[PDB]
Amino acid sequence: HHQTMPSDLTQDEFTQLSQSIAEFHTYQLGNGRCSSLLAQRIHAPPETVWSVVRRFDRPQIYKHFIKSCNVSEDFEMRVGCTRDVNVISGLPANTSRERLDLLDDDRRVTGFSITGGEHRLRNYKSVTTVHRFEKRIWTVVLESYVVDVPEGNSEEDTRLFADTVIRLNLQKLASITEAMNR
Numbered sequence: 001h002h003q004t005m006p007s008d009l010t011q012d013e014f015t016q017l018s019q020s021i022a023e024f025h026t027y028q029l030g031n032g033r034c035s036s037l038l039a040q041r042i043h044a045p046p047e048t049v050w051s052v053v054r055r056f057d058r059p060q061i062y063k064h065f066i067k068s069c070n071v072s073e074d075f076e077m078r079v080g081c082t083r084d085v086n087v088i089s090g091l092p093a094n095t096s097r098e099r100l101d102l103l104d105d106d107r108r109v110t111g112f113s114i115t116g117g118e119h120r121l122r123n124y125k126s127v128t129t130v131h132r133f134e135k136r137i138w139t140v141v142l143e144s145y146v147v148d149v150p151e152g153n154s155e156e157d158t159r160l161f162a163d164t165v166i167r168l169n170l171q172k173l174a175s176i177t178e179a180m181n182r
């Protein structure tokens with residue numbers, strides 16, 4: 001009977017995904033670090049959702065606020081590879097240099113680090129996992145990150161900021177992967 005946020009896992013989701021949260025979405029914290037975890041239900045099959053989420057060279061497919069994303073001409077999508085993204089004009093960030101940490105097509109886990117460019121999300125590190133759900137098939141996407149808290153900002157402000165980006169991105173991901181349906 002308390003105030004439940006829409007990006008929080010529901011009880012049912014948590015009971016299905018608790019171990020994935022333990023393995024993939026938990027961070028060591030304390031002292032100028034903050035982290036968060038967001039969930040997005042998607043009425044599309046997990047493999048469709050994953051096929052988008054895994055495209056490290058093409059975040060624009062579903063992420064917002066990207067003027068451009070450039071990978072090298074000899075780009076092979078493997079762990080360690082990098083992308084340079086340019087944020088649309090007018091935001092508090094201009095560029096992000098990002099590195100692919102994780103890519104598991106079997107378990108549907110990917111992750112990246114910002115290493116990082118013109119912005120105030122220092123040492124951002126993020127993981128996204130995609131999961132099947134039944135009760136007739138739907139997907140739950142979990143996305144989390146840990147990131148430094150800028151000297152004169154609060155943890156709450158930092159989290160609100162990063163959460164807002166992730167939250168929109170996951171809405172877009174849901175929208176486009178649901179769009180075709182059948």
Ligand SMILES: O=S(=O)(NCc1ccccn1)c1ccc(Br)c2ccccc12
Nearest residue numbers: 065066085091093096119121162165166
């Ligand atoms: O380059 S990004 O596409 N990184 C993906 C990303 C960045 C931050 C949080 C979640 N996900 C990006 C987009 C929009 C904003 Br506002 C950003 C602000 C700072 C750094 C990067 C930013």
